[PDB]
Ligand binder design. Structure first.
Ligand SMILES: Nc1ncnc2c1ncn2[C@@H]1O[C@H](COP(=O)(O)OP(=O)(O)OP(=O)(O)O)[C@@H](O)[C@H]1O
Ligand SMILES: Nc1ncnc2c1ncn2[C@@H]1O[C@H](COP(=O)(O)OP(=O)(O)OP(=O)(O)O)[C@@H](O)[C@H]1O
Ligand SMILES: Nc1ncnc2c1ncn2[C@@H]1O[C@H](COP(=O)(O)OP(=O)(O)O)[C@@H](O)[C@H]1O
Ligand SMILES: Nc1ncnc2c1ncn2[C@@H]1O[C@H](COP(=O)(O)OP(=O)(O)O)[C@@H](O)[C@H]1O
Ligand SMILES: [Mg+2]
Ligand SMILES: [Mg+2]
Ligand SMILES: [Mg+2]
Lengths: 534, 105, 316, 202
């Protein structure tokens, strides 16, 4: 294709961006290098705008500074989006005039042989945003864009300017700033892959390898393998923490801290430091959170019957299809049953066993007091964060608590239902995958809403429905011994029961505070009331 | 036996055989020391070692509570038992690492 | 040849025919740059500079995207897995589409044409309208879908729809697709509840003709036709087309043969069981049940497929 | 091997050690070796918990071990007095007391601890947040500064400030357990017990 200039990025301090740099340079800086003679004989004007978007911490400002230094130029200015709105007319105009003044002065003094004056914006999706159309309750009215637009192109335009904008929300930018002649090149910086992580780690541990401060058991390929969905600004934090861990072993605590001065001669960084820092310190933001599998799977999962295995087997087939199929990148499933039957624990277990690098849970526990206009935004953000990974998984708990359903009238939210209906059939970008699980207890209501044509399949979580299954559950929990087990089976085994696992645990706990010779009768007294005839 | 036959899970008959960690089978069906594979589903196979006890009724295999909890077996459920042969040239074990804890608190 | 470049840049503004040239020039000067310490010009590569066709073609394909043209990367998330001929009801639809496409361009007394595609859920209606639009070669094509308006209010959807329509009165022949008409109205059977502000704008935008000499074609897709008939929305359209489900064993076997999934000896076992009944299944649900049964072991795929088919896809 | 009894803190054993390891363990080494590693110091901490549980005591007793100058206490509500020029300028007149030592001797500066209470209404106003963010982070900033924040409501805290480079250490100081109460009572009745002014009944 296009023959590109030969660069090396290990000397500049950038890793993984082997294509964004090339295209940016070709489309924005390949004409500022040539001598002005041929530039005049061609009459080609210069690009005076660039836009960069992507998740935070992925190295956008670093790229801008390195590009600026590559083309000998002044120190780039800097501005902030929300800062410029802290005042009103008569104050922000002076601030705007205080950015381009030096460029104007140098253009006057020199003319067509001046020096480039880079300008770096930040969070440009606030001033350049009339998009107050979202949310039933939101309003925006701004006029700060027009002054910048006039300055960029038009009267008293400058030939020695270059504006670089950065944002995290590409879909909130007004389309008046993207026309040909103002912010025309666009680029996306995304999360690195394994090779990029290896390059970044090799770049950030190069000044200690020179001085023999790195141990011999430190292997970097395993570190690259173990850090999945890590940004570029968190591998740096990993290295910093691993360094600060080793410098602590060589400190002696006295009236006032001081260095060992005897074991400080062999200061080395070991594999143990890196492993300890990975277990304790760094917590990625697009990774799996392991603190949310102890609040949901509380008392484990025991096998009390046949139905408790079909669910798990079906969950494995769906995981193996959202990872190995190319005709079905998005799949959905609904777990349903009568209340107290154990639906949240099974969904959490399936998600945990999935092994994907991104796992998230949406729960009504985090939205107590919210309005619908805010629940929609929270859910949309949770879903948006899932499109940056190559493999994701989202759980949605208590679908009937999100809509605010009350049988009297009945009442619910029609602003959340439509969003939830639209988000279950939108596919991720490029070739990425996604898997959604959802738990509900009122399937008929969901049917009346035409909400079962959005899911791909369903699974039924049943109750205990026989004496043998109840006896098996009691044996597996191990609370009543044989003497009392025979008594229990001599009565329960002659009928059919209807009880959930959660209620069974509650009853077993309630019927254990009585004296040792009344427990067996109290348990049966409670069981008779709760469920003994369907 | 070699092809595989359907069997019914049973409870361990004696404490000594429970501690032996060997599935208890009938003499009419197998012999002591023979190793078998028990299938509970397409993706669920577990290798066990057999020991013969008179009290085992033919057509059923007895497992201890730890075995049932490990393999997810339920008494009365059906399983597939097939004779298993080890490759002693490769499968002979030199060292095991075992995590040990008190059985009862 | 400047003459040939004037026939490929349809619906280009004057300010983009300038960006095309600048992009071609910038591409041409990339082949003559070098950077060892800091970027510097090679003094032997700046002499034989000749901007060639290849640069123009590359810039036209990759870098320039007109605002009044066909976005050829947005009917690629809609026609995903293609189009196949499982039965007769496909050719009929694809032929009525071309008849309407020719009427809207060669007719003088009907500058406006509308059509509606309706059928049961999962029957393949969104991937047929996109194909019908993609094969018309109209300079302007646009798609109005409800998944780019999540969280919007009633008064913020009318403005978006009206803008999409107003951009189409600036082109000499256009095409617009309105997808999931029942999701724009915010319809829920309980109640019922919907938006009477969007409905009254839609009922008017379907009949207003473009300026003199210009032409327009509109395609809409829905699955709940019995509701749009009570709203009096079937009088705003000029025609309707029915997109059906698969309804015989032979059609199922023909559909399976074109996807190329089950073996010859594994297709007789299916044929024995299936060819004794009638079926009711849509082409979007027959690809979800052929991917769940391929994740099993090689000796249990047919049984799992048949069990899944029986559990759901019985007679009408 | 700390001797917590002499310092005067009890019930906080895994918090003091972690804070010292993560935020202070590099500032007791010579600049020469720290230059050979490329390490950069941490310039933020966040401590949250119920009121009166030993957060200022810890901060002031950890800054004296290093043999630094007195911490400069500042309140949250006080800063937002009237408007810009009396609050923004008042913001300037805090880092200013230490803005000089760097421009005179630079490296080899001491370390100025700048306590900053509440930090939950100031950053819900936006002027103070922007000024502080530019002061701690950006192109121009001091390398002889350490900012410590305290709050009682952890969620209201913004997310733009809890990122690497910004305040990047979070600690919770909760109520003490049985052993903590025992050790605190041991510490707080040591002078009397030495003068035989404590009865044997106690
Ligand atoms: N199959 C199972 N075997 C044993 N214990 C289980 C099983 N499933 C869940 N549990 C445990 O029983 C409890 C299940 O409660 P869970 O949170 O799943 O309730 P639920 O079905 O969501 O009910 P609710 O109607 O209150 O929303 C948890 O303690 C979980 O650990
Ligand atoms: N002959 C065919 N006709 C239509 N779609 C087909 C055909 N062969 C394969 N497909 C694929 O089947 C799927 C069905 O299309 P699509 O998902 O748009 O259906 P739909 O009727 O719009 O569904 P929904 O009711 O969910 O809106 C698409 O992937 C389409 O590519
Ligand atoms: N691709 C990368 N290679 C090397 N370092 C990186 C990369 N991306 C980020 N970093 C590190 O992250 C730090 C800050 O990242 P920054 O560029 O400020 O993020 P943002 O792009 O959100 O502004 C830098 O000091 C840099 O060392
Ligand atoms: N762990 C502790 N050990 C000893 N004294 C403590 C401890 N925690 C609190 N105190 C005492 O209680 C008071 C705590 O005040 P302070 O720490 O300033 O409160 P705050 O947590 O609001 O900053 C001081 O008198 C201090 O001596
Ligand atoms: Mg639940
Ligand atoms: Mg559709
Ligand atoms: Mg204080």
């Amino acid at each position: 294709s296009i023959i590109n200039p030969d660069w090396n990025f290990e000397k500049m301090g950038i890793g993984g961006l082997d294509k964004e740099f090339s295209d940016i340079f070709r489309r924005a800086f390949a004409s500022r290098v040539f001598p002005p003679e041929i530039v005049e004989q061609m009459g080609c004007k210069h690009v005076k705008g660039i836009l960069l978007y992507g998740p935070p911490g992925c190295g956008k400002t670093l790229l801008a500074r390195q590009i600026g230094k590559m083309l000998n130029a002044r120190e780039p200015k800097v501005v902030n989006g929300p800062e410029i709105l802290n005042k009103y007319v008569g104050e922000s105009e002076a601030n705007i005039r205080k950015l381009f003044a030096d460029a104007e002065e140098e253009q006057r003094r020199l003319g067509a042989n001046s020096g480039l004056h880079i300008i770096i914006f930040d969070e440009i999706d606030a001033i350049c945003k009339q998009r107050g159309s979202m949310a039933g309750s939101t309003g925006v009215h701004d006029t700060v864009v027009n002054q910048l637009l006039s300055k960029i192109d038009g009267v008293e335009q400058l030939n020695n300017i270059l504006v670089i904008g950065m944002t995290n929300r590409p879909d909130l930018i007004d389309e008046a700033l993207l026309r040909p002649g103002r912010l025309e090149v666009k680029m996306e910086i995304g999360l690195p892959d394994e090779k990029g992580r290896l390059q970044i780690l090799h770049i950030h541990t190069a000044r200690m390898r020179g001085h023999q401060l790195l141990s011999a058991d430190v292997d970097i390929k395993e570190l690259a393998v173990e850090t999945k969905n890590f940004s570029g600004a968190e591998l740096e934090g990993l290295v910093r923490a691993a360094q600060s861990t080793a410098m602590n072993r060589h400190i002696k605590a006295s009236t006032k801290v001081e260095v060992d001065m005897e074991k400080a001669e062999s200061l080395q960084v070991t594999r143990g430091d890196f492993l300890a820092s990975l277990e304790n310190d760094i917590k990625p933001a697009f990774g799996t959170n392991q603190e949310d599998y102890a609040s949901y799977i509380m008392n484990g999962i025991i096998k009390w019957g046949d139905p408790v295995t079909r669910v798990l087997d079906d969950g494995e087939l769906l995981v193996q299809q959202t990872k190995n199929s190319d005709r079905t990148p998005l799949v959905s499933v609904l777990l349903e049953g009568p209340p107290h039957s154990g639906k949240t624990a099974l969904a959490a277990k399936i998600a945990e066993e999935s092994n994907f690098p991104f796992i998230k849970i949406c729960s009504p526990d985090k939205m107590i007091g919210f309005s619908e206009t805010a629940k929609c935004q929270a859910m949309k953000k949770i879903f948006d964060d899932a499109y940056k990974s190559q493999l994701s998984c989202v759980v949605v708990d208590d679908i009937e608590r999100l809509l605010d359903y009350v049988p009297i009238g009945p009442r619910f939210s029609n602003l959340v239902l439509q969003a939830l209906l639209v988000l279950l059939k939108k596919a991720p970008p490029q070739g990425r995958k996604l898997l959604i699980i959802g738990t509900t207890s009122r399937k008929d209501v969901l049917q009346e809403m035409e909400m079962l044509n959005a899911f791909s399949t369903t699974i039924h979580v049943p109750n205990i429905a026989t004496g043998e299954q109840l006896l098996e559950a009691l044996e597996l929990l191990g609370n009543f011994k044989d003497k009392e087990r025979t008594t229990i089976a001599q009565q329960v085994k002659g009928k059919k029961v209807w009880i959930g696992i959660k209620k069974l645990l509650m009853l077993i706990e309630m019927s254990l505070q009585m004296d040792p010779e009344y427990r067996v009768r109290k348990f049966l007294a409670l069981l008779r009331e709760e469920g003994a005839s369907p | 036996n070699m092809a595989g036959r359907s069997m019914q899970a049973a409870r361990c008959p004696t404490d000594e055989l429970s501690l032996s960690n060997c599935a208890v089978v009938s003499e009419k069906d197998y012999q002591s020391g023979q190793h078998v594979i028990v299938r509970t589903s397409p993706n669920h196979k577990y290798i066990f070692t057999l020991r013969t006890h008179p009290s085992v009724v033919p057509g059923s295999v007895a497992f201890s509570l730890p075995q049932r909890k490990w393999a997810g077996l339920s008494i009365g459920q059906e399983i597939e038992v097939a004779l298993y042969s080890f490759d002693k040239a490769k499968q002979c074990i030199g060292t095991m690492t075992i995590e040990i804890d008190f059985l009862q608190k």
